Design a protein around this ligand. Structure first.
Ligand SMILES: *[C@@H]1O[C@H](CO)[C@@H](O[C@@H]2O[C@H](CO)[C@@H](O[C@@H]3O[C@H](CO)[C@@H](O[C@H]4O[C@H](CO)[C@@H](O[C@H]5O[C@H](CO)[C@@H](O[C@H]6O[C@H](CO)[C@@H](O)[C@H](O)[C@@H]6O)[C@H](O)[C@@H]5O)[C@H](O)[C@@H]4O)[C@H](O)[C@@H]3O)[C@H](O)[C@H]2NC(C)=O)[C@H](O)[C@H]1NC(C)=O
Ligand SMILES: *[C@@H]1O[C@H](CO)[C@@H](O[C@@H]2O[C@H](CO)[C@@H](O[C@@H]3O[C@H](CO)[C@@H](O)[C@H](O)[C@@H]3O)[C@H](O)[C@H]2NC(C)=O)[C@H](O)[C@H]1NC(C)=O
Ligand SMILES: *[C@@H]1O[C@H](CO)[C@@H](O)[C@H](O)[C@H]1NC(C)=O
Ligand SMILES: [Fe+3]
Ligand SMILES: [Zn+2]
Ligand SMILES: [Zn+2]
Length: 340
């Protein structure tokens, strides 16, 4: 009754959710689906209560009537006075990243190169870059722009899936979940770093969390920030320390969504769960930490300080902001359960 069914996407999120479930005394339970879109349907049906979603999916979920409940909040320098849960969200920086040794590559010469995206329909991996390109290009043929790409969630037989790798056994190629090797923020950066693609569309934090010894991960043990460059909209290349003057846009933080009729309940439970397993929670380091998953960003992003209340009880459009919402609509003109 006062229990919440979390929806996990893929088997790695399933295992993490199962651990959370066990540590919660069954206050949290788990439903699992192969894609985020499916998890969304599970929530609409009332078979699942909630999940955390990137902005692009919140637009999908919002049209079907789901609402924003609480947002991911990472630690910041400004607004230091307020507590994390009451602290305003800041938004993340969407960037395009390349190897510095790849001289001569700029925003203006991306056509026909190889791209690495977090997944179709996500903010920094798809909506922002492809929105910009369709525009600058006056064409809806975003599938013919790059020569080859890894964009999880596209047709496995298309060039958009040419560079995706699948799992250990080469199965599940291009599925939009963590079984795909190049899925998500981490997977797209790895696609760039192993030199599978020429550019990766992720967010600023990703570059920082996987270089200069921050990851220990085999593929990233030896990655140095100086070996990378951000591509700016004015045709310039800059070091990753200049993300504030060289980004594609500021994205709205990922947020937990649920059915509006379940919102108050989902909110209550999560605030208590984070007091127990959050950053400074009663049992985090010692028993279970909600916001940790070895650089894999399972259920929540690993750099999450807390889940914050929203303020102004915003609809989904208000949460994403008028700038972002029109960007998506315009892109969608190129391309229930599509409820509107
Ligand atoms: C782009 O994204 C980045 C990444 O999110 C933003 O950079 C962050 O900026 C914030 C606020 O502006 C910085 O605030 C600091 O946060 C730190 C916590 O991460 C605090 O510093 C301590 O804790 C760090 C984490 O443990 C630690 O790491 C940093 O420094 C060392 C050496 O320089 C390196 O790694 C160390 O820690 C890791 C943890 O796993 C460990 O593996 C190592 O063994 C080291 O112990 C690493 O390079 C990293 O930079 C510090 O050593 C220190 O102990 C600090 O108190 C303060 O709150 C935040 O540090 C920045 N994030 C990182 C990871 O660099 C950036 O602002 C974004 N840009 C824009 C424009 O928005
Ligand atoms: C790709 O191109 C489209 C078409 O221009 C861009 O959409 C346009 O973007 C601007 C920014 O939001 C919109 O202008 C705004 O309009 C409102 C009122 O209409 C005004 O209050 C704001 O101050 C601002 O001027 C414009 O409406 C919108 N055009 C349409 C037809 O919806 C789009 O943003 C571009 N894509 C990306 C990803 O940048
Ligand atoms: C489970 O929820 C009940 C009711 O709120 C509460 O007594 C208990 O603190 C919760 N336990 C855990 C581990 O979340
Ligand atoms: Fe995102
Ligand atoms: Zn800006
Ligand atoms: Zn409002």
């Amino acid at each position: 009754y006062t229990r919440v069914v979390w929806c996990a996407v893929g088997p790695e999120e399933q295992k993490k959710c199962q651990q959370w479930s066990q540590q919660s005394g069954q206050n949290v339970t788990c439903a699992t689906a192969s894609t985020t879109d499916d998890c969304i349907v599970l929530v609409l049906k009332g078979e699942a209560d909630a999940l955390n979603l990137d902005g692009g999916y919140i637009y999908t979920a919002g049209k079907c009537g789901l609402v924003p409940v609480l947002a991911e909040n990472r630690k910041s320098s400004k607004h230091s006075s307020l507590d994390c849960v009451l602290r305003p969200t800041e938004g993340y920086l969407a960037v395009a990243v390349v190897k510095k040794a790849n001289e001569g590559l700029t925003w203006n010469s991306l056509k026909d190169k190889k791209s690495c995206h977090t997944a179709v329909d996500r903010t920094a991996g798809w909506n922002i870059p492809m929105g910009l390109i369709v525009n600058q290009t006056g064409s809806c043929a975003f599938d013919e722009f790059f020569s080859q790409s890894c964009a999880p969630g596209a047709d496995p037989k298309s060039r958009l899936c040419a560079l995706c790798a699948g799992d250990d056994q080469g199965l599940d190629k291009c599925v939009p979940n963590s079984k795909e090797k190049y899925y998500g923020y981490t997977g797209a950066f790895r696609c760039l770093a192993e030199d599978v693609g020429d550019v990766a569309f992720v967010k600023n934090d990703t570059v920082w969390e996987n270089t200069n010894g921050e990851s220990t991960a085999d593929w990233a043990k030896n990655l140095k920030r100086e070996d990378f460059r951000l591509l700016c909209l004015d045709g310039t290349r800059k070091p990753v320390t200049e993300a504030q003057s060289c980004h594609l846009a500021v994205a709205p933080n990922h947020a937990v969504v649920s059915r509006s009729d379940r919102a108050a309940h989902v909110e209550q439970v999560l605030l208590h769960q984070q007091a127990l397993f959050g950053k400074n929670g009663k049992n985090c380091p010692d028993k279970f930490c909600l916001f940790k998953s070895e650089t894999k960003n399972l259920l929540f992003n690993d750099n999450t300080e807390c889940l914050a209340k929203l303020g102004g009880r915003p609809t989904y459009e208000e949460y994403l902001g008028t700038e972002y919402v029109t960007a998506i609509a315009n892109l969608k003109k190129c391309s229930l359960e599509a409820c509107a």
